[PDB]
A paper describes a structure:
Of particular interest is the Trp161Phe variant that decreases k2 by more than two orders of magnitude compared to wildtype, leading to exclusive use of the product-inhibited pathway as k2 « k3. The reduction of amino acid size at position 161 from tryptophan to phenylalanine leads to a slight lengthening of the distance between WAT1 and Gln143. From the cryocooled neutron structure of Trp161Phe Mn2+SOD, it is apparent that the Gln143-WAT1 hydrogen bonding interaction is perturbed compared to wildtype Mn2+SOD and may be the primary cause of the observed kinetic effects. The bulky Trp161 residue likely constrains Gln143 and WAT1 to form a SSHB for proton transfers. For the Trp161Phe reduced resting state, both chains have the same structure, and WAT1 is forming a hydrogen bond with the amide anion form of Gln143. For Trp161Phe Mn2+SOD, the protonation states of Tyr34, His30, and Tyr166 resemble those of the wildtype Mn2+SOD though there are notable structural features. Tyr34 engages in a 1.6 Å SSHB with WAT2 where Oη(Tyr34) acts as a hydrogen bond acceptor. Besides Tyr34, the other notable structural feature is the hydroxyl proton of Tyr166 that points away from His30. It is unclear whether the orientation of the proton has catalytic significance, is somehow related to the Trp161Phe variant, or is a consequence of cryocooling.
Human manganese superoxide dismutase (MnSOD) is a crucial oxidoreductase that maintains the vitality of mitochondria by converting superoxide (O2●−) to molecular oxygen (O2) and hydrogen peroxide (H2O2) with proton-coupled electron transfers (PCETs). Human MnSOD has evolved to be highly product inhibited to limit the formation of H2O2, a freely diffusible oxidant and signaling molecule. The Mn ion is bound by inner-sphere residues His26, His74, His163, Asp159, and a solvent molecule denoted as WAT1. The hydrogen bond network extends from WAT1 to outer-sphere residues Gln143, Tyr34, another solvent molecule denoted as WAT2, His30, and Tyr166 from the neighboring subunit.
Author numbering:
A (entry chain A), B (entry chain A), C (entry chain B), D (entry chain B): 0 to 198
The structure:
Amino acid sequence: MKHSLPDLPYDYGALEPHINAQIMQLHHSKHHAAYVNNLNVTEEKYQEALAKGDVTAQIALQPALKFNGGGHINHSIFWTNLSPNGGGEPKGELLEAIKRDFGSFDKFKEKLTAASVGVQGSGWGWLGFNKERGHLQIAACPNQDPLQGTTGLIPLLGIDVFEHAYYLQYKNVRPDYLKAIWNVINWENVTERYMACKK
Amino acid sequence: MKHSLPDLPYDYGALEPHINAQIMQLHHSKHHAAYVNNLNVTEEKYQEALAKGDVTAQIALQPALKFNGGGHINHSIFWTNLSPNGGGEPKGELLEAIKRDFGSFDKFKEKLTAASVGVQGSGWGWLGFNKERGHLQIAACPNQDPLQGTTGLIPLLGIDVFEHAYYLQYKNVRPDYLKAIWNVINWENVTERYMACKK
Amino acid sequence: MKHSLPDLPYDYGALEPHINAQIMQLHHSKHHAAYVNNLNVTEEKYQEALAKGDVTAQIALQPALKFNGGGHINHSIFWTNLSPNGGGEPKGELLEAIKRDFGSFDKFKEKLTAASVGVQGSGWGWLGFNKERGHLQIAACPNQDPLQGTTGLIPLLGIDVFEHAYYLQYKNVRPDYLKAIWNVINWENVTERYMACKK
Amino acid sequence: MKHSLPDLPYDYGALEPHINAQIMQLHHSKHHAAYVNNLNVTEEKYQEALAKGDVTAQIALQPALKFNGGGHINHSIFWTNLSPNGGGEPKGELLEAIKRDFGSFDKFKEKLTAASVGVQGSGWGWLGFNKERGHLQIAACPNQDPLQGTTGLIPLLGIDVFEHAYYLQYKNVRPDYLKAIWNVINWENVTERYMACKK
Ligand SMILES: [K+]
Ligand SMILES: [K+]
Ligand SMILES: [Mn+2]
Ligand SMILES: [Mn+2]
Ligand SMILES: [Mn+2]
Ligand SMILES: [Mn+2]
């Protein structure tokens, strides 16, 4: 069973002017394509090392597995977290959870923006669900370290703050990118992920 | 005593076509300027925390100090490591050390390229001098972690592989950037740093 | 400011049989004494580095500062978290918060035990207060990384799971140490720290 | 492949008085046994995750795999690095390499001691062989991070500085443990590992 690059759910220019078409095409067709391919190569090497009991080889593969596997995990969620139909505020139970856990939607936006801008180097800001506590939680992750695999939190909304996610359009001004991306957040998808967490 | 942003030793377009003028101007006047300012802010906070014996505050400042202080250290070296008069091969004792420690100049280039391309996320590749062993050594550093402060090796030549160092021109293809940068390496400066290591 | 080794709030054997006297004496008079001594030396080197603008030296000193400074922070709290008059359950608002945030006192004990037993290598388990969220939160920290300095959470109760905290008595069986330590938790002190977090 | 706890090449008391029998028995029959048991369980979970394409599970298993897998790697080498017939100095080409790369045997001992005493928290000191450079190299590793899997260096001689390696006998005084262990270094084994590195 081989991982595959999911198609983007919209056209490359569908998020303009907030994220331009050149970024979207590079981010999906170059960056994510590389994560998927490198992940499949690493998984095959890991299976061979596992069959031989070569623990040294398994451990040597860990950085590539986490970076490319995390890349596949994170970007697969990210594309569904964005939409030309996005923006605005969520509704229903997700909005009530946001108000309850963060005070208000705007306070939530400030907290997730702060986590995202606060990443030094490459990384991600996340809104997650803490299954044990039964409430929302914000965390930042370094590089491609994925949220569920490294924290146990269920990913609801992720913000990529690798420079390749914004640099062509916003250059060094990452806060301008964070300002723009709220306009294309697919709250329908974040709600779907949130409702799946509760039963 | 306040750290200051050093002027670039050449014009913004002096490294074209290998690194374009837009990158050089952003890299120096935006990125490095921010490292210097954030470093001075962090040092002042650290002095206040030290005077109060607030160890919690000192430790909370460590990520900003290492990232921005390392940024200042690394980029101050980087600008002198590049030159419109660069390229080619070093001469004299540095060239002999390279041949002795790495086999050949081309083998050295392969090793430093591999360390630089191998950085997952943001970071730097370095040629350093090991004072204890009295020979050259290649290392990679994550994010802005500076070479001497984190490994003890004396920096001779650094390659910035943060995406902001290349993305506008080379997009995702970091190996194309590594290929181009050999044309502007200031071997006169790397030789100066190397000869200072020996006495 | 010259940090000092705090006097223990009880004699070394006051926590027997749950933590034996030899451990308490070594832990305070050798391990914590070393954190304090190393912290003072490192702080003096940082004052010198700041006066010279030596950023390389500041960064090279960071691991010693975090390990010994964190050691001083963590153990100063730890001694006050324990008492010969301790054990049992908290009362009042802290007990209500524990039931609310973790389900029950017994479930809280399972969660903090699991976090503490789960540390691979040296580290700490913590019950903290999240000031932003206004509720309790459990976290683990590697090595001596202090809770507030690295996470912002306010420490309420810490469990040292460095091997020196238990090995002489419990050897490799860290779970037996975790079970025993509940008998000497100073819930009066933890309640004080919790009430200080609220207006 | 089901990993197994290797038999010790000697009885638990064979390294006395330098490492006492209680430590050796605990270290092998409890600590290393646990690495093996935890490694086999984790490998089975990784086989299941690979079959399902569960990348989140693969990444969540990485800390346990590196800690217990590294533990298995490191301790399997460690037992062979020690002997009741050990101590003294190596001879032949290994001794020549030590004098060449470190100045003298005594200077090498100082460097490996300093690296081992310098580990903050749990970890290992190593003498390794750098295959690319064709010479000896000293490195420290955090926790159970194995030398070859994380650095590419081939392990020749390892010094465990987890507290369980020395605490029962030497308490906090890790330098006394480092001085004593030179009396039981199996230089015959280290020489074998060194000669295997060369054509
Ligand atoms: K009691
Ligand atoms: K002997
Ligand atoms: Mn990305
Ligand atoms: Mn840069
Ligand atoms: Mn301790
Ligand atoms: Mn061990």
